[model samples]
Target: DTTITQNQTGYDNGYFYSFWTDAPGTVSMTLHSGGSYSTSWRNTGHFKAGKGWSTGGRRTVTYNASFNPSGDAYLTLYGWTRNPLVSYLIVESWGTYRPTGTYKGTVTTDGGTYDIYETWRYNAPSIEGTRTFQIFWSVRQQKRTSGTITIGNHFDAWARAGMNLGSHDYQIMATKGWQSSGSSTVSISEG
Candidate 1:
């Protein structure tokens, strides 16, 4: 299998995870029991293929990850694009976040039926770094404290909504959510 490049940012007090892209192929982290953590990685390049109706090419990037948190935590996967060097569109994200509740209607994906949630951060300064312009995410809250999650763009509406038409990359991220619960470790495989 071909390998993707890696780019990373974050700190290493152990409570915070240090993340990298496909390089080294796998990633693991252990978080403090009562502490908060934030970290991210970008694959730098874009994922591309022929249009879906024309050729059956790679239409989406599948994210495979493992999480085993003893307490509470959040794993977020983001797809993004940039042009103005300080501007970007979130495209999409999968995992638990704010303005959330148990979605009355079931949303399906490669990860299975999910209780959906939404985030519109395109204009928020706290959510977006100085270089970011807009932020948007649709996430699936996890069912267990630990397990494997397989995710991708499984809906056409997302494309019609705002998913970029051309090249884009991603960010694999984690944060301390709720109160005292936190993850012991999270890992990702490059395959």
Candidate 2:
């Protein structure tokens, strides 16, 4: 789950590459030029989590991004798709999950408030292109705009509120999935 992805875009001969706005904490990515969206996961310079991250644990990732189509893009976090399971909690700074999925309500963390969403996706063959099933905990930002967006995973928020466990222990869950080597929160901004 510690893999990094570079997602970028071009406009009028210029490009907006997904970059580390703040080391290890936040990344800024532009909307995909010719696709449904774009991602900044390439900023491995930021977030990092362990390989066995599961439910009942807490983790948070902060992002600095903007939405061009407003609701078509997402600032996502969770397990990268390189493993046997594909799981992620997406952030729609626009504050909407749309069409399906249940609204699990709200929670506050990482000094920010976010709207919680729980979703299940079947990635047929797993991350390594293996065969297995994986569940993901998803979240979306409540406000729409270009600013600091932090998403926290309070797995029990939904479980305690009558949900199921599909997913860990960690100090401070970094931007992508990095685990800090302390009992207290560490800044991903520090190299």
Candidate 3:
């Protein structure tokens, strides 16, 4: 925010004098054949709500495509794992939600049974480097569920970093767990 103006004049041995010089935030100035002289300036600045330097939120992710077969590219996140009891697989991307509404168990559907199948071969230059012509596929996983199911499932993923050799690009792959076309609640029961 700034607005400033300045003018000056000086003259004859017959005695007509004027000299004005000042410096700060430079707010006002106007001087003609000797008819005006002035001053004004201010700078302190402030902003508050959460206070401090302002308000906040920060996050960064750019994984154009890389989740591969470093070791048997298997993704059988089949929630409700093999009858008997516990089997949770909540992996949502984009519109994420691990555990919402009614406080149900809090998300950790597998990752147990020791290797409840978990693998992240993030290396498409994932040292956080490569991304120039890959457009969009910054990776996504935020809405996956299986806190309670009772049978029948299907899966065979290969997003383990596949397809790409420096030419032609177009992507569409979003279908893994968290099922629903009319009813979604991945298996829950406590009788």
By summed lDDT, which 10 consecutive residues of candidate 1 come out lowest?
47-56
lDDT of 3 by residue, 60-91 (tens): 11111112211111111212211112222222
Local distance difference test values of all predictions, in order: 0.32, 0.34, 0.20
Q: Which candidate is the best by lDDT?
A: 2
Q: Report the error of model 2 at residue 172, Å.
A: 14
Taking all chains together, the TM-score of candidate 1 against the true structure is: 0.42
TM-score of each: 0.42, 0.40, 0.16
The candidate, 1 or 2, that scores higher on lDDT is 2
Runs in model 1 with CA error above 4 Å?
A: 1-72, 84-106, 115-118, 122-128, 145-151, 154-157, 162-166, 173-181
How big is the positional error of residue 43 in model 1, measured in Å on the Cα after superposition?
30
All-Cα superposition RMSD per candidate? 11.8, 13.0, 28.2
Q: State in Å the error of residue 61, model 2.
A: 3.9
Which ranking of candidates, highest TM-score first? 1, 2, 3
Better structure of 2 and 3 per lDDT: 2
Candidate 2 lDDT by residue in tens digits, 33-85: 22122333332233332111223133343333333222222334344332233
Q: CA shift at 38, candidate 1, in angstroms?
A: 12
Please identify model 3 stretches exceeding 4 Å from their true place.
1-78, 83-87, 96-101, 104-174, 177-191
